[PDB]
Amino acid sequence: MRRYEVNIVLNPNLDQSQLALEKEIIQRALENYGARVEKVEELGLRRLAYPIAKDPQGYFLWYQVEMPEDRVNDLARELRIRDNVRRVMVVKSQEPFLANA
Amino acid sequence: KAKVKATLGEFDLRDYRNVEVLKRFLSETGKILPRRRTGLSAKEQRILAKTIKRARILGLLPFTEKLVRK
Amino acid sequence: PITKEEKQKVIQEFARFPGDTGSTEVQVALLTLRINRLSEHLKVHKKDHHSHRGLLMMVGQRRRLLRYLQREDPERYRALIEKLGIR
Amino acid sequence: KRQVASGRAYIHASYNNTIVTITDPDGNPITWSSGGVIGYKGSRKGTPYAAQLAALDAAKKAMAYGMQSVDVIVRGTGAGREQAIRALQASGLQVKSIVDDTPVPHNGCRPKKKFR
RNA sequence: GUGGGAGAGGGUGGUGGAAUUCCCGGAGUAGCGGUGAAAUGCGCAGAUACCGGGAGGAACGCCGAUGGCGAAGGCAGCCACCUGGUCCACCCGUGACGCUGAGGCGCGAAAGCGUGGGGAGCAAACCGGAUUAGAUACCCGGGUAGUCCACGCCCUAAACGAUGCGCGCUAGGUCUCUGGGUCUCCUGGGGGCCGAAGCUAACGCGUUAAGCGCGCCGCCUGGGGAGUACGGCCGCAAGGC
Numbered sequence A: 001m002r003r004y005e006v007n008i009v010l011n012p013n014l015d016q017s018q019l020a021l022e023k024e025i026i027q028r029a030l031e032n033y034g035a036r037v038e039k040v041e042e043l044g045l046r047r048l049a050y051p052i053a054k055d056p057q058g059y060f061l062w063y064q065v066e067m068p069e070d071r072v073n074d075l076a077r078e079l080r081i082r083d084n085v086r087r088v089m090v091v092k093s094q095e096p097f098l099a100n101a
Numbered sequence B: 001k002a003k004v005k006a007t008l009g010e011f012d013l014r015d016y017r018n019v020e021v022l023k024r025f026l027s028e029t030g031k032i033l034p035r036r037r038t039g040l041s042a043k044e045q046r047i048l049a050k051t052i053k054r055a056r057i058l059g060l061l062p063f064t065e066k067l068v069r070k
Numbered sequence C: 001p002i003t004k005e006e007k008q009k010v011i012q013e014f015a016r017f018p019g020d021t022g023s024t025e026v027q028v029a030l031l032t033l034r035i036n037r038l039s040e041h042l043k044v045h046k047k048d049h050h051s052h053r054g055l056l057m058m059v060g061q062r063r064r065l066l067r068y069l070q071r072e073d074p075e076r077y078r079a080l081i082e083k084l085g086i087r
Numbered sequence D: 001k002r003q004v005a006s007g008r009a010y011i012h013a014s015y016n017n018t019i020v021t022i023t024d025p026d027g028n029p030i031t032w033s034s035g036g037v038i039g040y041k042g043s044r045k046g047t048p049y050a051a052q053l054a055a056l057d058a059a060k061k062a063m064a065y066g067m068q069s070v071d072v073i074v075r076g077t078g079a080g081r082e083q084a085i086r087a088l089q090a091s092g093l094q095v096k097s098i099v100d101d102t103p104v105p106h107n108g109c110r111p112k113k114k115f116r
Numbered sequence E: 001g002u003g004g005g006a007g008a009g010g011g012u013g014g015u016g017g018a019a020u021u022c023c024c025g026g027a028g029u030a031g032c033g034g035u036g037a038a039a040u041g042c043g044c045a046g047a048u049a050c051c052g053g054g055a056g057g058a059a060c061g062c063c064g065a066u067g068g069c070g071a072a073g074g075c076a077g078c079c080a081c082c083u084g085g086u087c088c089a090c091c092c093g094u095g096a097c098g099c100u101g102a103g104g105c106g107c108g109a110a111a112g113c114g115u116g117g118g119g120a121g122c123a124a125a126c127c128g129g130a131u132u133a134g135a136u137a138c139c140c141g142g143g144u145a146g147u148c149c150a151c152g153c154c155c156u157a158a159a160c161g162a163u164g165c166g167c168g169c170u171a172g173g174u175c176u177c178u179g180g181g182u183c184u185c186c187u188g189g190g191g192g193c194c195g196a197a198g199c200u201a202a203c204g205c206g207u208u209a210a211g212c213g214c215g216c217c218g219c220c221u222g223g224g225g226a227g228u229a230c231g232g233c234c235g236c237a238a239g240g241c
């Protein structure tokens, strides 16, 4: 297992049944692919820099995980399958290098 | 005509999530600034590139903007 | 990929006495393990040559130490092989 | 008959011709002009002069449609890119903003031999 | 061995934006393109320039360097996985286990061959346009193989530092990449520039030798004829040695 940050951005426009729901599905995918959860930072609406799926903005969340480094790739493909997940980026954890620090 | 890391806090260079800081390293045009103006170091620089490009993908920073006046 | 206590369990198994991290046994094993993983990934990813260069060098090193051990104590050499499934 | 009065002016210059386009603020164009439009024919079209008479022609047509205040987008480089600008200046339209949009690829396409 | 690094080293999957082309839609006319100037070409079946949407291939701007990695060929979006090399510190383990390497076996840019895909841009061949002694070569417009991917061949090159690999020794200075230290600096590996001694026909090289030495491999012995012929070997061929 290694430590990762899964990044998910969604289309903002959702009602709460819809948002809670896609978040839940994400949860069950994470749970299913072997991923432990450690932290969650859900930042919500940020105005994007350039349009993504015709939307000026996105609904962000971030998930620190530790999961079998075999399965990261598939857990990514399954995260992405849902239509209303606009972008998904999984990254390995690096420690916090700081300069001019 | 001064340098970036000069006036700026003491900060994560590995942060793809943190725009409020990273924007400061880009041109009016979407461009990443050369060392000559970021005041960085060769390694510092490389990490700044990668963290921008990641950030860019996430829609947090621009791949390009447009030049004003001219 | 080879990790800490994966590697340790091998050093345990082959150390000719407590704490020996360095002997012909330990190297030839540790190495042979390393080869085996490699030739394993190179059974897929046939098309990756640069690693295969690596493995040529790796095997070369093994047969070097091996030849050495064989020269010095034959009993221990047979020993190493009867463990490792080689030559 | 239109009613526009505020909108975009896209100057597009090349080393060969120069072409202006005036357009409603959602970008559906309104009138336009170019080097061959006003008199010129050959090489002549990529002079700065033409760039002027062009930028001008297009403006006096926007006047005809009702135009006044206009935000400019410049695309291209070339002889008299600045001429269409400076023409649009004292054109009688007053220029809200000047932006440079010349698209560059992020390196994708093989260019033809005269270009490498 | 333990602990740390840096990196376009390699393989596989996935994904991002710009641009080009094309398709649909809106607005909108009379040209656009292109050159030294032209013409072919495209355009009233509505082009160009402009906005929105879609399809698809290929390449990755800025960062980028006079930088990094690799044994060489070579390697630049981002992520993940799968791997190779290599540097440093600690001075822990083994105890000469070393160097080179005919033959072998592997790798080997591009172009080229085979069979399948793919095909946006470019583009040998080719089809056209003005230059104007004249293209039919330089310029302009089309354009097929090919460039892209999978598997399999080909094995060449200015494959270049025109400088075989290892090791020991012989002033410094300066810029730099990456480690360690008690961090006006010093110490270890890389990359550059001047330059002791020395070398060199000269040019130049000079702790990244072309200096001083030892080991080992490859190679050389006027020019034309000729990388030809003959013979073998390899190859589907082209052709290679």
Ligand SMILES: [Mg+2]
Binding pocket: D016, D017, D041, D042, D043, D044, D045, D046
């Ligand atoms: Mg012209």
Ligand SMILES: [Mg+2]
Binding pocket: none
């Ligand atoms: Mg280590």
Ligand SMILES: [Mg+2]
Binding pocket: E008
């Ligand atoms: Mg790489």
Ligand SMILES: [Mg+2]
Binding pocket: none
């Ligand atoms: Mg790679």
Ligand SMILES: [Mg+2]
Binding pocket: none
């Ligand atoms: Mg249309």
Ligand SMILES: [Mg+2]
Binding pocket: none
């Ligand atoms: Mg005509």
Ligand SMILES: [Mg+2]
Binding pocket: none
């Ligand atoms: Mg016609």
Ligand SMILES: [Mg+2]
Binding pocket: none
């Ligand atoms: Mg027709």
Ligand SMILES: [Mg+2]
Binding pocket: none
């Ligand atoms: Mg479009």
Ligand SMILES: [Mg+2]
Binding pocket: E056
């Ligand atoms: Mg098509």
Ligand SMILES: [Mg+2]
Binding pocket: E064
């Ligand atoms: Mg550059």
Ligand SMILES: [Mg+2]
Binding pocket: none
């Ligand atoms: Mg080269």
Ligand SMILES: [Mg+2]
Binding pocket: none
């Ligand atoms: Mg590694």
Ligand SMILES: [Mg+2]
Binding pocket: none
């Ligand atoms: Mg000792």
Ligand SMILES: [Mg+2]
Binding pocket: none
């Ligand atoms: Mg001893």
Ligand SMILES: [Mg+2]
Binding pocket: none
């Ligand atoms: Mg050797």
